[PDB]
Amino acid sequence: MDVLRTPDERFEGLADWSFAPHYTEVTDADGTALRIHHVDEGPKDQRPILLMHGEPSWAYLYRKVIAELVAKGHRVVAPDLVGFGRSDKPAKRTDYTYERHVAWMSAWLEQNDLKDIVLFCQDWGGLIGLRLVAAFPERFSAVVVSNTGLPIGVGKSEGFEAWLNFSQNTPELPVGFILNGGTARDLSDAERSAYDAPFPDESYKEGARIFPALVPITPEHASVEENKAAWAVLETFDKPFVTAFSDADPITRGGEAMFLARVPGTKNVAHTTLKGGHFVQEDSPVEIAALLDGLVAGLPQAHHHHHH
Amino acid sequence: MDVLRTPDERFEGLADWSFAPHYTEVTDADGTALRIHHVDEGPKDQRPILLMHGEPSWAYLYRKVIAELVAKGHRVVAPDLVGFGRSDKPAKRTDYTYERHVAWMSAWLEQNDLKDIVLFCQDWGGLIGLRLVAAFPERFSAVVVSNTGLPIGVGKSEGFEAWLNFSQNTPELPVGFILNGGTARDLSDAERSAYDAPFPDESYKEGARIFPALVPITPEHASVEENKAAWAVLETFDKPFVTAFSDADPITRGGEAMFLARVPGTKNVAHTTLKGGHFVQEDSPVEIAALLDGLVAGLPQAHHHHHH
Numbered sequence: 001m002d003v004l005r006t007p008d009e010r011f012e013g014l015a016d017w018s019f020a021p022h023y024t025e026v027t028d029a030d031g032t033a034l035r036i037h038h039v040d041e042g043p044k045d046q047r048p049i050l051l052m053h054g055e056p057s058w059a060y061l062y063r064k065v066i067a068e069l070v071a072k073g074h075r076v077v078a079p080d081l082v083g084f085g086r087s088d089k090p091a092k093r094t095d096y097t098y099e100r101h102v103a104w105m106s107a108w109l110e111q112n113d114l115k116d117i118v119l120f121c122q123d124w125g126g127l128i129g130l131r132l133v134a135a136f137p138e139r140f141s142a143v144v145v146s147n148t149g150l151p152i153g154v155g156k157s158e159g160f161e162a163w164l165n166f167s168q169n170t171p172e173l174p175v176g177f178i179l180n181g182g183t184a185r186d187l188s189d190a191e192r193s194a195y196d197a198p199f200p201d202e203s204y205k206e207g208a209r210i211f212p213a214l215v216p217i218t219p220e221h222a223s224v225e226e227n228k229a230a231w232a233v234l235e236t237f238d239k240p241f242v243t244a245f246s247d248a249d250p251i252t253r254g255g256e257a258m259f260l261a262r263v264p265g266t267k268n269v270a271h272t273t274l275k276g277g278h279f280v281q282e283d284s285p286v287e288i289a290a291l292l293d294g295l296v297a298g299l300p301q302a303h304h305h306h307h308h
Numbered sequence: 309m310d311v312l313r314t315p316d317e318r319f320e321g322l323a324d325w326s327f328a329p330h331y332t333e334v335t336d337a338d339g340t341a342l343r344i345h346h347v348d349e350g351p352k353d354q355r356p357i358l359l360m361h362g363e364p365s366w367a368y369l370y371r372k373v374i375a376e377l378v379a380k381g382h383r384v385v386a387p388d389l390v391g392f393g394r395s396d397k398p399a400k401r402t403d404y405t406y407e408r409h410v411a412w413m414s415a416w417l418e419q420n421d422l423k424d425i426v427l428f429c430q431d432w433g434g435l436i437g438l439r440l441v442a443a444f445p446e447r448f449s450a451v452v453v454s455n456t457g458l459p460i461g462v463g464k465s466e467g468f469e470a471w472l473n474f475s476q477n478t479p480e481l482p483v484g485f486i487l488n489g490g491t492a493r494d495l496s497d498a499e500r501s502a503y504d505a506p507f508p509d510e511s512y513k514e515g516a517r518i519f520p521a522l523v524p525i526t527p528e529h530a531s532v533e534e535n536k537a538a539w540a541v542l543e544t545f546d547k548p549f550v551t552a553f554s555d556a557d558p559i560t561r562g563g564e565a566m567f568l569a570r571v572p573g574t575k576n577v578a579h580t581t582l583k584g585g586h587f588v589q590e591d592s593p594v595e596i597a598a599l600l601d602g603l604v605a606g607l608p609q610a611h612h613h614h615h616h
């Protein structure tokens with residue numbers, strides 16, 4: 001693969017983002033080494049709260065959630081998907097596939113040897129993060145899903161399809177503008193600029209351009225088979241599994257029901273509806289941090305595992 | 309469903325079979341209540357060693373293994389699949405499907421609330437038993453697979469296909485004769501009669517007739533999707549998972565490799581090749597019992613789980 005790397009000057013002076021970058025080198029099956037970025041804040045003796053972003057955001061989306069949780073004594077880890085943030089960015093849309101993202105982030109997870117994880121995932125952060133849970137369930141102590149899903153090509157998803165068709169018809173993808181359109185609150189120019197930071201020009205956006213087309217909404221899509229298999233693992237996942245979808249995101253709203261129907265770990269936890277749009281982290285960051293803090297505190301009294 | 313029930317007189321005076329019958333009523337989705345038979349020998353405070361038979365045998369196949377393990381202080385449980393043994397027998401070939409067998413035995417397993425299980429499975433005992441492991445992995449402390457598989461419609465299986473075509477072309481299925489043809493040692497007339505016992509005439513054999521046709525050897529077969537999903541669970545199964553295939557069964561020999569390739573619990577156990585034919589329990593019962601006894605003894609020092 002041809003690979004782009006955003007210059008570091010782009011990440012200077014960003015509103016409410018001073019977290020030091022960490023990097024991991026993962027090797028693709030084609031031999032290409034890709035550098036993935038994450039932040040890691042707080043004490044290493046605490047279990048990691050893993051925060052996963054989706055399309056077309058980056059770990060910046062969690063900046064307030066990170067600050068709140070760190071202030072409460074937690075360890076917080078937030079990676080950038082390949083194509084996004086401070087991670088490397090394959091140069092062709094055709095370089096990105098759902099299975100490739102899963103393989104890349106699986107390597108990242110194993111190489112950083114993250115365990116005892118409390119996962120919060122949203123959009124593609126969940127499409128990929130939930131595949132990590134299904135591949136490595138004993139690495140996860142609890143999961144929170146918000147405005148996400150694990151599609152299997154079934155039914156209609158017209159909310160999402162409206163976004164899909166727009167995202168493919170448009171000749172350019174104005175990322176800060178999209179973030180603002182998917183948040184109830186009005187993002188400042190500085191905040192929108194931070195979302196534009198990874199992408200000095202359109203050539204850096206090929207992962208952002210193709211992501212919607214990778215969502216498996218038809219039976220013929222790539223990754224339908226793999227996602228159906230992953231659901232069989234999630235049907236056995238009995239540790240706390242919380243839904244925290246927002247009230248004003250018709251793109252993903254329909255994704256919640258299958259978790260409640262199929263995942264045993266949803267039975268003995270309280271679910272909530274958060275206030276906000278698709279990018280709920282901009283609308284309800286304090287509430288998300290409070291939810292995760294309380295979830296962590298209750299783990300010893302909840303169902304848990306040993307010997308991994 | 310129309311359902312046949314073999315008269316109890318058929319099970320009197322069988323060579324080396326005096327174990328008292330236990331019964332469980334399971335209700336099919338179509339409303340039909342089916343009675344399933346099992347034997348349960350030894351102390352209830354010991355973990356159950358669950359022995360599962362396949363086509364066209366019944367729990368009688370394990371009579372010596374049961375005796376050996378009971379003499380060693382173990383609890384042993386051996387059920388008859390619907391269509392077989394002392395279990396009820398739907399009257400039409402079309403009543404039997406792979407998914408129905410899994411549903412029936414899943415109900416059986418849950419209703420008897422078997423836990424801490426050490427499973428030994430062979431032929432369809434494994435095609436169904438391994439689906440129980442994938443559905444309820446925390447119920448299983450260890451698994452031993454012998455002369456079995458979990459097919460996903462891939463590759464060629466010409467050994468099995470030779471049996472398939474015979475089994476479908478033949479107008480009648482002489483069950484004792486088949487058992488003798490699939491065992492290295494010569495079964496006595498009494499032993500063959502015990503294998504014929506469940507089937508007073510051909511009308512009782514519809515489950516035995518169709519079973520080979522249910523094995524998913526083409527991509528279009530029913531249960532391919534479900535078995536691929538189950539494999540994703542087995543890819544996470546890290547408790548002892550032993551292969552004990554025999555040396556002289558070309559029908560199933562090719563089924564072993566995928567377990568060693570995909571199941572993590574195969575890594576830190578010793579695998580063995582048993583002597584004998586397809587129905588290896590007739591050829592090496594003492595060795596099977598010794599293997600299971602040793603496997604049970606080592607569990608506390610092996611990888612194990614808590615809190616289920």
Ligand SMILES: [Cl-]
Pocket residue numbers: 055211212213215
């Ligand atoms: Cl998308």
Ligand SMILES: [Cl-]
Pocket residue numbers: 363519520521523
């Ligand atoms: Cl068969």
Ligand SMILES: [Co+2]
Pocket residue numbers: 025
């Ligand atoms: Co290097």
Ligand SMILES: [Co+2]
Pocket residue numbers: 020022039040041
């Ligand atoms: Co750090």
Ligand SMILES: [Co+2]
Pocket residue numbers: 054055123124212
């Ligand atoms: Co999306």
Ligand SMILES: [Co+2]
Pocket residue numbers: 238239303304305446616
């Ligand atoms: Co559990």
Ligand SMILES: [Co+2]
Pocket residue numbers: 243244245256271272273
């Ligand atoms: Co909800």
Ligand SMILES: [Co+2]
Pocket residue numbers: 304305306615
């Ligand atoms: Co504990």
Ligand SMILES: [Co+2]
Pocket residue numbers: 333
């Ligand atoms: Co009754």
Ligand SMILES: [Co+2]
Pocket residue numbers: 328330347348349
């Ligand atoms: Co008994």
Ligand SMILES: [Co+2]
Pocket residue numbers: 362363431432520
């Ligand atoms: Co068979």
Ligand SMILES: [Co+2]
Pocket residue numbers: 138308546547611612613
């Ligand atoms: Co384990």
Ligand SMILES: [Co+2]
Pocket residue numbers: 551552553564579580581
């Ligand atoms: Co072997």
Ligand SMILES: [Co+2]
Pocket residue numbers: 307612613614
């Ligand atoms: Co222990």
Ligand SMILES: [Mg+2]
Pocket residue numbers: 179180181182183184185186187
């Ligand atoms: Mg907004």
Ligand SMILES: [Mg+2]
Pocket residue numbers: 072073293294296297
């Ligand atoms: Mg706290």
